[PDB]
Design a protein around this ligand. Structure first.
Ligand SMILES: *C[C@@](O)(C(=O)O)c1ccccc1
Ligand SMILES: *C[C@@](O)(C(=O)O)c1ccccc1
Ligand SMILES: *C[C@@](O)(C(=O)O)c1ccccc1
Ligand SMILES: *C[C@@](O)(C(=O)O)c1ccccc1
Ligand SMILES: [Mg+2]
Ligand SMILES: [Mg+2]
Ligand SMILES: [Mg+2]
Ligand SMILES: [Mg+2]
Lengths: 357, 357, 357, 357
């Protein structure tokens, strides 16, 4: 009855006001693939995918364009569609770029389903819209800029910031955290992210020094696939270890949670499998007793977290702000879901043409 | 915006053509509580609860009637409602009759949400309607009646039956299974259910003899809360152990699956927490690799199983057939979801008055 | 020979001098069901059940009244009666309100057995009456009232108080504990109860700060059914984690103790299964090496704890003081068992009529 | 000193004499990306990648072409190159198509290193060339064609065949195996592959029936990422469970072997990370005591298996035979490594132009 009639993709590369510098490399621009999922009902679903590096941008677009044939004329039924794609990529490997591609379709299909029923996505999933606390995510900025950005964030009403650490010396890590604490006061949340840059002995040593400084969480201290190593670091700390932005699908989350790799989780809406993957992940987090935050995709995450039983923090990191209307607002540090059908993503078409690849 | 405006309940006690005789007692009639959830949008959600024994019928109705005050004027948002009820019964014990009461509300609220959007529940959950294979569930009927009912079931197109066993002697258990096999042929599925009547040594002994007869699964061989004892029985069998009809909420399922209590699961839509509890349970079954069947509530289960990744069998046991229209059909042994908004439950009002308690 | 001849129940709702405010809600009045179990020997057994909220009061009474038929004309043999009820509710779910109902009968049946033999219950169970240390249980009262109530309690001879915590900020939790310590001195026991209000990371953080303040125990820091999460909190503390008021039956206690969820236990006489459930629970606590305290039902708990090998503290929280005679006394902080047959519960009939629902 | 000077890729789609039909889909043609890695020493390294489906072919080529910039002017040092690529894709996800891309480069770089030193790759890795037993891999061919292909394979000197199974009924699985056994005699190896098509209960049931038929191994009975489910199937069998073709990198192998998922391993040279990933995987297989076979890439696998301590079988499945010279020979069922520098891959240029995409 409602059928998918087309898939259109546009690759853009948008410059970011502050490049996301990390201990393992810098994301200087946002390579995005903007997806339009056409339906027989006359509504168009919208989502975007983040390619992390320009190196993978054209390849991701191409993969989606070649995938268009297997979803056209399929019912607009995202759970059924996801099962069909899992099965079609069974032999090839339903992970990495292929999984991310599938999640893009999923997110657009749920946005389109929300538009067919004229209802915000959070209400379609059976929950009420509520304000979700958000933290402002910054990068490996050095002491001076890190302190300047955190003071701006408190002035805009955010009650917590995430800074990136993993400097050559632990004393630089501490200097950044202390200067931020000096400027914003002891009430403020300071999350820290190592972006997988430390081996386990180094991570235990540096994390116990940061724990004395009173940080909110320590994020991805070592290689993301090493769940066992994260469990080993977590067992030596009182502060929570946070991870999850790199889990491809709920099955990777399930393996990490099964061994006690972390006390907090933050799935990425794209890598976890879109809305369909997020519903499954929230059921896992609930049963393992894990507070669940988001990573990127702040527009759809505001919706998914209001439907998440152990919802913890929304990560504010506006990668797509230049190409979409500001319908998601931040008021007093909380994200406010737009009262719009679907996810509330509305392209700024004249701006997109400026970044087209 | 859509608000719950009222809750009306009616307790009925319906005589069953064949009483469900089990090794631990007989369900002679179906004690049901039929729920009408009124909304500000002018649609009325419908669900029913099964009380198992007339002893608990009036108490369950009363509990629901006293609960009416905490949900009236709440938004019709079943995930948010469920979280509020979990929290309101935090001190008292969010389990047993209270949980079952909450699930009744949930099922009615999702039926009403489906009616607000004019869509079958399965399509609201993001899946396509598909035919779900069903088995006919019979009872501890003795050799002659068990064989007569299984032959009728094959004639109606069912490709599997469940019989209840747990007779004084193992040789009576085997005689029933063998006579059914003789009559319906070696292709047919014969599920067997012990209804918690055996201790673990007895269950290992009787199950290994039944396994040589080639049964489809062995259901609840010992006390349902003894997950460890079920794991012990399962480790001595090649045939799967089936359980789950008695789990109150996905947290009980999570404990049983975590220790490997069974190779198959069959949540009860009421005891697992309604639609909201079923979505969480299907995410668990998927990650633990457990084929998931249903127990009772065949009308809503046809919908929930089409949205369940490891969906296995629908249990046909028509407890409410006298008071609701036959919109769910069985064709060639498969349940066919009605193309009706919500769940497709339509009361037969003149019949209800005949059974009112 | 001694037969049960009748069961009479009365629901009352008694206002409490101090409402029990907790972090997850307030128990403003005591909804009680007072049970009279008539026997052929001419003695009447007495017990009461606590319904936690008025919402479940009439339903609990109704359930007991409908259950009356299965116990009338049964021998006054509480272990045999309990096995019969476990078996009769096998299919339905021998937990929640049904289990609590069964425990009410059990407690009344043991009180009646004590009256048939003219002996205090503790002596019927084979033990000597001894004074049991008791703590006074208070609620989420804020700094000023919490300090006022603790000073009154020391003046009445209690050597320990339990306060409820779980305020929005940890600093409010600490302020309450510190002001109480300031007023009553460093010798005094300060137990703290979170009433399941924290997630595991939050509970580890807040509990390690309270541990530095020197609290006696930390009670139910997270959701009560999450035994694994309690084990995780307990492994990060030197102070004991206390729980158990919400275990329905010794089988739930057995699961929690098997995984090391807590270092202390405090079964509720009603939820654990009455006297018959308490004897089984004390055998479990003894073998796992768990000091065992009580939750509510201070009249029968004074008796059961004198028969409990690892008996630790009696919780004084007088919910039924308005409707029963003060035969249980507190002398120098110890509960003194009355030298009366059975449990020593004697209704104040003119007062009951004031609270009848 | 030896520097990489360029990377050239060509995508071809080659028709296969027998399409590889499996229980989860058919690989009708071989979508390949042929890689030429130019060096400053004037030798050109060669490798190819298998894309499984035409849907991912152009995307894989594009990814490699965009990756060319990060390896040009790097030393021809494959272990150092691999570490740099792991680090460059740290944030993005060093798995799926990106990992496969990196492995293509690795295989070409080791072929080029072998050409710089004028030595066959196996001798560069420190081992002697030896004949490696090979089995002929067939597909889900039905009884008649499966028997015809196995008889041809015995006539060509192969002493074992792999057939694909996973037919609707177990009786079709058995019929295929029995007819092959009838035709080739009881000495012959019959491997069977389910290609992830069964859930765990079904896999235990079907595998125990196949075990009575005397099959050599049972390959990927359930979803490949479900290591725990494979462990569960393996614990119920005497016959070995075989898997590994889908592990992306030695870290996935390490997780599966750590839990005892299988008794045999067969890494895919591309998915495991090329030569550099294969050396690491062989060290793992040796210490866990796992006989190690290969999956596809028969030209480089003949070399890697002669250097593998627990080397078991080479899989003969000639996907690239139309575009490369037949330098690898099969004599008496054994693969014979060519006495050529590097891997021994020599393009048939006029044929490539016929399949260019
Ligand atoms: C059939 C297969 O699993 C094998 O050879 O083991 C395979 C899977 C994908 C492509 C080729 C072969
Ligand atoms: C406050 C409590 O947890 C306790 O006394 O430990 C409690 C909970 C419900 C009712 C009364 C008391
Ligand atoms: C018989 C039963 O266990 C089943 O259908 O599996 C059942 C138990 C209680 C009520 C109805 C059916
Ligand atoms: C910095 C990061 O880890 C985070 O926000 O947590 C990140 C990683 C890749 C891209 C964006 C952000
Ligand atoms: Mg991060
Ligand atoms: Mg059953
Ligand atoms: Mg308490
Ligand atoms: Mg294979």
């Amino acid at each position: 009855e409602v059928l998918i009639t087309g898939l259109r993709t546009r690759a853009v590369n948008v410059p970011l006001a502050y490049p996301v510098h990390t201990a393992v490399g810098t994301v200087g621009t946002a390579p995005l693939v903007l997806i339009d999922l056409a339906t027989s009902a006359g509504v168009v679903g919208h989502s975007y995918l983040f390619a992390y590096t320009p190196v993978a941008l054209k390849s991701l677009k191409q993969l989606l364009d070649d995938m268009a044939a297997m979803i056209v004329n399929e019912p607009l039924a995202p759970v059924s569609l996801e099962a069909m794609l899992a099965k079609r990529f069974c032999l090839a490997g339903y992970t990495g770029l292929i999984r991310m591609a599938a999640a893009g379709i999923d997110m657009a299909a749920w946005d389109a389903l929300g538009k067919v029923h004229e209802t915000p996505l959070v209400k379609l999933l059976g929950a009420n819209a509520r304000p979700v606390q958000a933290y402002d995510s910054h990068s490996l900025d050095g002491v001076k800029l890190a302190t300047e950005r955190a003071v701006t964030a408190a002035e805009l009403g955010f009650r917590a910031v995430k800074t990136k650490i993993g400097y050559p010396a632990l004393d630089q890590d501490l200097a950044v955290v202390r200067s931020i604490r000096q400027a914003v006061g002891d009430d403020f949340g300071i999350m820290v992210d190592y972006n997988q840059s430390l081996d386990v002995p180094a991570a235990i040593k540096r994390s116990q020094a940061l724990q004395q400084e009173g940080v909110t969480w320590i994020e991805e201290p070592t290689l993301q696939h090493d769940y066992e190593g994260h469990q080993r670091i977590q067992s030596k700390l009182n502060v929570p270890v946070q991870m999850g932005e790199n889990w491809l699908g709920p099955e990777e989350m399930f393996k990490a949670l099964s061994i006690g790799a972390c006390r907090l989780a933050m799935p990425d809406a794209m890598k976890i499998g879109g809305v369909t993957g997020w519903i499954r992940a929230s059921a896992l987090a609930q049963q393992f007793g894990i507070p669940m935050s988001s990573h990127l995709f702040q527009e759809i995450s505001a919706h998914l977290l209001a439907a998440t039983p152990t919802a913890h923090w929304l990560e504010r990191l506006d990668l797509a702000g230049s190409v979409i209307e500001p319908t998601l607002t931040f008021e007093g540090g909380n994200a406010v879901i737009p009262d719009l059908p679907g996810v509330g993503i509305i392209w700024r078409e004249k701006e997109i043409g400026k970044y087209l690849v």
